[PDB]
């Protein structure tokens, strides 16, 4: 009912999920019964009891055949496109019809045949648990949610997600992209200022990396490019640390059998490497300790920031080549980017943020935890933005939302080139920024001449050009020429340009006037 | 309204117009571009309010065609250059260093010419199709050898330096010496130039000159000759290097083997330079432009 509903924001990734709500028009991320705000997207079964989150990851080693994880991608996907690389730990998907299925023991009695649950069933159960934990935290029953999704989910995947939510008794008001949630999480803050910026969203997760280029003008954003890399990531860093520590164990015990063959040892090493890497992110030094890893023997060591960075250097330039690949795909230059937001768990590490600081000029602002005091948690950005959207959209009806989310509303003539005025001294000044959608009225204040009097406001077209590096403007076709009579010495002239839908351009040059229309 | 501290041009004498305004140009559909917005944020919700007032029911189907103008999603062929790999390349027994590459990833007709995105895309296709997890029931346990081959190829080729060294050591795509006596009548001004571009892989300067034709000017032909004479190869041959224990009794052992590796690589590099110059000289001897130029 429009009068009564309960909305939340959900971020649902391959590695982990998160839930959030809004208190006093401010987004706050919800902790579950375990106290976690970043809840691993892992499900595990012991004696027929359903567990999720930290308990499941801890029980991962104990239960080989009853844990399911990294199933987010599998949703709404055909057998041909299944990606099983990260699913070695998870139970082997069995092609039943068109819907792969996991076979696990979800009953309490020990002599029961294991069930063959679908991926949709598993997502449904996970959404029930998430909603339930949100329900205990809020004291009320959660009824609605906005869930974030990547931009490359197919329509079949969206249908699978909505069907899973419906089976989980959760109606999805809207699906939003993680870059849009990240930008909204900042823009909807009290202290935020709307302004024309080139925004790069770098969402660095566990199994994936996303770099997205957006232009945000007048508080509205237009997608210029997006890239998704599945090769370089925190899991790959986990493997290189497991390798190096394995080395050290092999040297310390001459003859010790190789760790890789034993699954239990593999899982223990990965979980402990994850703990250690997070600790080394926390502070300068970190320690690694495994108990009864093999044959009851024990091991420990210590590692530090610089050594970890050296052993992990190659992935850092892999992230670099990804970011330049994305900028080249967007046809832009690092001098063209205004802000780069670091999102996702991997973004926290200071080194990567400093590396992008070295790649980009100082005029670019890097919003990352270690390089900016006013930054927000990259693991909380998506969930808080989703909660803020689920809050602000409450007023409209369900049909109203279906209509507001149709292509007839979102699509409109964005003006490619820039519109500006020519300044001369004894240069192109942009008023309408490039790639700006139809009626985005803008206003500039210019200086009068040395003595003033009659003054010429000549509005022309403009294009950006890079000179080796420094960005300059290039004057193109001339649009209009107006005159202001008797301007005072030192006065300011106000110039407004409005490029309304119909493509009509209204020009105003009033001193603090001449007005004109271009059909 | 943004304040900018920049001065306006003084109006020239004797200029006027109706209401002091002159319309010269306008914006065009070529001067614009259609992109699609993400339906998020309060300003989008206000825009949606305005559009719902203007049009009510949205013509999604009608405006889908207009939205089609720009697309930011793409799909590619399942197998662009499907390779038979007879008998799984004779079951492709694991043999490190010896095993060829590029053919297993099915990037043939590209080899040295490729981009990271294409390489990753091919990698993902190959792994998905041949992954033991997906098709294990159909006797894929035997195809574990091929699966390890796939991973070895992926690691060898993804990393830039390893791929570059493997390319130099054995491209397996070098054409034989141009314009042999049997291959007579092939144009000396075209076949040789083609060989130069085919063998300009290691050139330290991107604007490499070309052989030219009968009318080619003296300055260009001379610059071409000078550039080739004074080259600067980055190439080297280390994929064939002798193996060493990954855990090595410290720095000393690597240096001890490096000794042999260094003398081998230096002599080999010298021989490669020898061959390169020997070709340059054959071309200089064959080329007739110099003979007419000196007599004049
Ligand atoms: N407490 C933590 N704080 C920060 N990062 C963490 C923490 N615990 C784990 N990580 C790491 O952070 C990364 C998760 O980042 P991110 O939030 O972008 O992923 P996700 O939302 O689960 O999934 P996706 O990559 O599909 O968007 C992983 O590499 C994970 O190992
Ligand atoms: Mg993420």
Author numbering:
A (entry chain D): 9 to 434, 439 to 480, 523 to 566, 571 to 577
B (entry chain C): 3 to 298
Copy text from the publication.
The challenge of nascent chain folding at the ribosome is met by the conserved ribosome-associated complex (RAC), which forms a chaperone triad with the Hsp70 protein Ssb in fungi, and consists of the non-canonical Hsp70 Ssz1 and the J domain protein Zuotin (Zuo1). Here we determine cryo-EM structures of Chaetomium thermophilum RAC bound to 80S ribosomes. RAC adopts two distinct conformations accommodating continuous ribosomal rotation by a flexible lever arm. In both RAC conformations, interactions with the ribosome are exclusively formed through Zuo1 by a lever arm (residues 253–371) that we define based on our structures to include ZHD-αIII (residues 253–289), the entire MD (residues 290–354) and 4HB-αI (residues 355–371) (main panels).
Although a previous study suggested that the RAC-ribosome interaction changes with ribosomal rotation, our data clearly show that the Zuo1 lever arm anchors RAC at the ribosome with two main contacts (C1 and C2) that are maintained in both RAC conformations independent of the ribosomal rotation state. However, the lever arm undergoes a complex motion, which can be described by a bending elbow located in the MD (here denoted as the MD-elbow at Lys305). Although, in RAC-1, the MD-elbow is bent by 37°, it is straightened in RAC-2 (main panels). In RAC-1, Zuo1-ZHD interacts with protein eL31 via a mixed polar–apolar helical bundle (ZHD-αII and eL31 N-terminal helix) and multiple salt bridges between the lever arm (ZHD-αIII) and an internal eL31 loop. Interestingly, the eL31 N-terminal helix is rotated by 50° towards the ZHD compared to RAC-2 (and the idle 80S ribosome). Furthermore, in RAC-1 the MD-elbow rests on the 26S rRNA 3′-end (H101), with Arg310 seemingly stacking on a bulged-out cytosine (C3324). Another striking difference is observed next to the tunnel exit at the contact between Zuo1-ZHD and Ssz1-NBD. In RAC-1, this contact enables two salt bridges of juxtaposed residues (Zuo1-Asp248/Ssz1-Lys255, Asp249/Lys259), which, due to an increased distance, cannot be formed in RAC-2, resulting in Ssz1-NBD moving 10 Å away from the tunnel exit. Rotation of the entire 40S body, except the ES12 movements, in both cases reaches ~7°, and swiveling of the 40S head reaches up to 18°. For better comparison, RAC-1 and RAC-2 were built on the non-rotated ribosome.
